[PDB]
A paper describes a structure:
Tropomodulins (Tmods) constitute a conserved family of four isoforms that work in conjunction with one of several tropomyosin (TM) isoforms to cap the pointed end of actin filaments in cytoskeletal structures characterized by their uniform distribution of the lengths of actin filaments. Leiomodins (Lmods) are related to Tmods, and constitute a subfamily of three isoforms: Lmod1, expressed preferentially in differentiated smooth muscle cells; and Lmod2 and Lmod3, expressed more abundantly in skeletal and cardiac muscles. Lmods are distinguished from Tmods by the presence of a C-terminal extension, featuring a proline-rich region and a WH2 domain. We show that ABS2, and not the C-terminal extension, is the main factor distinguishing Lmods and Tmods as filament nucleators and pointed-end-capping proteins, respectively.
To test this hypothesis we designed Tmod–Lmod ABS2 hybrid constructs aimed at combining their respective pointed-end-capping and nucleating activities. The first two constructs (TL1ABS2 and TL2ABS2) consisted of Tmod1 residues 164–229 and Lmod1 residues 365–486 (or Lmod2 residues 246–367). Strikingly, at 25 nM both TL1ABS2 and TL2ABS2 had nucleation activities comparable to that of their full-length Lmod counterparts, albeit at higher concentrations the full-length proteins displayed higher activities. Importantly, both TL1ABS2 and TL2ABS2 had much higher activity than the wild-type ABS2 domains from which they originate. The structure superimposes well with those of Tmod1ABS2 (r.m.s.d. of 0.41 Å for 125 equivalent Cα atoms) and Lmod1ABS2 (r.m.s.d. of 0.27 Å for 124 equivalent Cα atoms). Curiously, the hybrid constructs combining the capping N terminus of Tmod1's ABS2 with the added affinity of Lmod's ABS2 were better nucleators than those of the wild-type proteins.
Author numbering: 177 to 229, 365 to 486
Amino acid sequence: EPNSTDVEETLERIKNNDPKLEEVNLNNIRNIPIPTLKAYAEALKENSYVKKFALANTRADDHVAFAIAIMLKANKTITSLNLDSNHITGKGILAIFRALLQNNTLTELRFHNQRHICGGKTEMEIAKLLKENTTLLKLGYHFELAGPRMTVTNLLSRNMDKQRQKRLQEQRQAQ
Ligand code: NI
Ligand code: NI
Ligand code: NI
Ligand code: NI
Ligand code: NI
Ligand code: NI
Ligand code: NI
Ligand code: NI
Ligand code: NI
């Protein structure tokens, strides 16, 4: 259904900060140039209306992951990011988790089913990095190592608890 037409036009709309574009979905669109995927990331940096960005199954690679990481350090709007079924490696994934040190607005990240498998050292490091982020509530990924898997689940439950705590101590103290 969507195609290179929509891809160029939607990108313009992002750059223009169109208030009516709250969701960008590129899922399953083939033959998007890597630099076009990068441009999406670059445009989204200062976009104030896009809440969800989904690029699943676009052949996005680490260059795309790096571009997205940069954008994540700046963007205060996107709450849900879908990277499933792409060519992102553990490097691209670490860059994103390092970016999340600087991001308190993204609550859902999913990278299921990458064609290049993450690696244990990367899973161990994701868990270490996630400790420093208190706003991510959902991580779409299935861990190979039982240890990082447990730690990440506990961290996500923690973050869920931290968000209720913040809201409650706002409501309580605002009387
Ligand atoms: Ni879809
Ligand atoms: Ni493929
Ligand atoms: Ni590349
Ligand atoms: Ni390169
Ligand atoms: Ni690949
Ligand atoms: Ni997975
Ligand atoms: Ni999975
Ligand atoms: Ni292939
Ligand atoms: Ni499971």
